[PDB]
């Protein structure tokens, strides 16, 4: 049958418009807060699989040491 | 023709050239020209059909549109206005410009001939009623672009009739037959105005009121955009409730693109800044909906709701309640920077309008009153762009902390946090984590300002930081934040500025803090600060090197004295004695991480501590964990120094005994009952085991072969046992912030073990007890396991597949221990095991040998155990076959029958003749092949 | 006119 796009329903019922006016809960959401604690902030940058699998479990604060670990990746 | 539509898609033309060419044709023959024009709108819908002269003369529009629908002769569902690419966006522009230019070029004569406009409006007001979307989307756009052109014409008419009214009253006040002609011109102009209104009232009633409620959002967004335009350009005539209401209702539309255009259209009526009274009454009725749209599910709409609300602050009345403003304020802490800075502008305008003293105080009170964030990084980032005048006034902040209503303890604590992040975001010229877009490169002006500010900070606080430290030397929170400024200073200013006196003062303050404070984070800052200042490439190295060596000399000598009594055989130490030992151990541990303290040889110091906890079982946990850390740093710093080929030979072999005995020590404490001790031993072990892996050699480091260490079966089991007991736990389904931090800890421990898996320190079969947890623990650990599955598939796909089936084998085995051997194949548990297998299957060129081995194992597992009561009765684990059939979808055509001959070696023929329920696993697997 | 916006009376 034809590829031409034909819409059976053109307008939106007045009744459906009054429903939209009375209930917009489905088009609003909650605040997606940004890391709220310095630790959660730190856990975002060091988080994620990529960082987790390429950095030590016990943080090494001198890159002279951190290298010793990243040396051994592939 | 094809010509008129073609001309517009690739014109590279002044569309006035096309319009004027058309108008001349219209003058020579109206009907020929209109037919060209009717067809033009029809081909702009992709119609391809042609209206003929015959049709023009005798056919109603309804009939024409029907004939055009049949003759559309489309190749697909696309029509011009739905194509992608800049070239087609230019067609839409050309389409709309032609319509507007045509009307405006006719506005002084042709438009009133009661023939052109009416004919076009009619075709467009009937093509906008068509169920054919192409004819309706396209005509609706044209109709709105015609109305806005007629709104421009009526505006001119209104202007010219005012001017004419002025000249009429001028002539009367001060020649009569001019008064007569002027009134006939006023008569003519009203007759013109009535005709333009009639036309506008027929494109509003015939198209708008029926297409603003279209089902195609792109058609609803077209209508709302253009009503906004009419109310913006001819405010006196169109900006009233009779037109505003359509935007008021449509901002409840469920499509974001439409809600967006409502806000845009309303922003344009407020950027006017004419302070309209009728717009003020609309916004009282819809205030509450607009505020709520700041949290619209579509962030782009939420940005515009905020931005509309900031323009609402210009309104004469106080329209927004206290509640409304505080809901906007919260959004400065949002993840989406576009939302945060839009709220920042709102905050700035509403509440911000030395000299900046009380401005700073108000920001501090706001930060304290907003009990959503504990840090201010995001607060600063939200207002970097607008309030950069205030946030970089460090003279004002430093003075507020010293020079005399006063500041409370909490206020001074928050002011230090605020000041810290302003300095951070200025030095590192980029936003905090979660607000940035891939660290785009900086402007020349931006890099200049990074330079300008860094000298200001270093100049000032190199002098003032010693003063602040002295005043708040006792407050951990305050000092933890203050100690992190050095990492942003410009090291060369400390010499060029004759500041050595302040550096001495700073170094002393740090030492007194080390001696008094024990906060693990206070000491972390002190160590990382010294590491930052101990850069051998700057002129102050030997100065800070001297103070450092003095500090370790005191701590190491005190540590010896303490151990000589703490470990004296009869001096059973109490809590007070232990806290003294712990306080110095913590300080040594923090510095040994960032600094090479090999010279003080602390390896034996902690060994005696750890072995005593083993023998007696009496050792405070905090002593154990920090001795574990310090030993870890002792070993690693030696490993770093032995890199040198020009190095002592005894030391390298000496190390193997330093590491081998440490592993067994940690292995002992891994079985301890205290949790934090287990966690600490586990993390150090997973790090040690990686540092010493085979990969230690790769980069030409063949010297280190004797150092390689391979774990026992005993150690591998103990490590896995920890994951099972500490990671894969009962799940719920102290509230969010803590529960997120707990999750991240467990993810670290999980990643620590998986690093050992994907790097083949441990047998891959260990990953089975992990792989089986994929779906059960998807949200918590899903991404870690999938990474392990991907890395292992690249290393060894047949071993990866062998471990995947083993995971399902274990899930199966768990179910028979829980439910029973006669379990329900319709159970939710069995359903989940095979769906887990279905996802496992999508992880499958060398895929042939893996899937084959997988079936070979899964088959043995099905028939491994025979029935107690009957060979014609079924093997015990035969139901596994229906799980394994989730994999056959992936198998090749060639090996499906080869696998069957293998299966026949296991299955006797009486069995294959079986069709009863219990054997429904078999036929299901048979149907596979 | 706040009776104008009342969509219970339609347009």
Numbering used by the authors:
A (entry chain B): 321 to 394
B (entry chain A): 81 to 254, 260 to 438, 455 to 505, 511 to 839, 849 to 959, 964 to 1048
C (entry chain E): 331 to 341
Give the authors' words.
Here we present the X-ray crystal structure of a segment of human SGO1 bound to a conserved surface of the cohesin complex. SGO1 binds to a composite interface formed by the SA2 and SCC1RAD21 subunits of cohesin. We were able to obtain crystals with a SGO1 peptide spanning amino acids 331–341 containing the YxF motif but not with an extended peptide spanning amino acids 331–349 containing pT346. The SGO1 peptide is bound to the CES binding pocket. The binding mode is similar to that seen with the YxF motif from CTCF. We conclude that the YxF motif of SGO1 is essential for binding to the composite CES of SA2–SCC1.
Cohesin entraps DNA inside its ring-shaped structure, which at its core consists of SMC1, SMC3 and SCC1 (also known as RAD21 or Mcd1). SGO1 protects centromeric cohesin by recruiting PP2A to counteract cohesin phosphorylation by mitotic kinases, and SGO1 also directly competes with WAPL for cohesin binding.
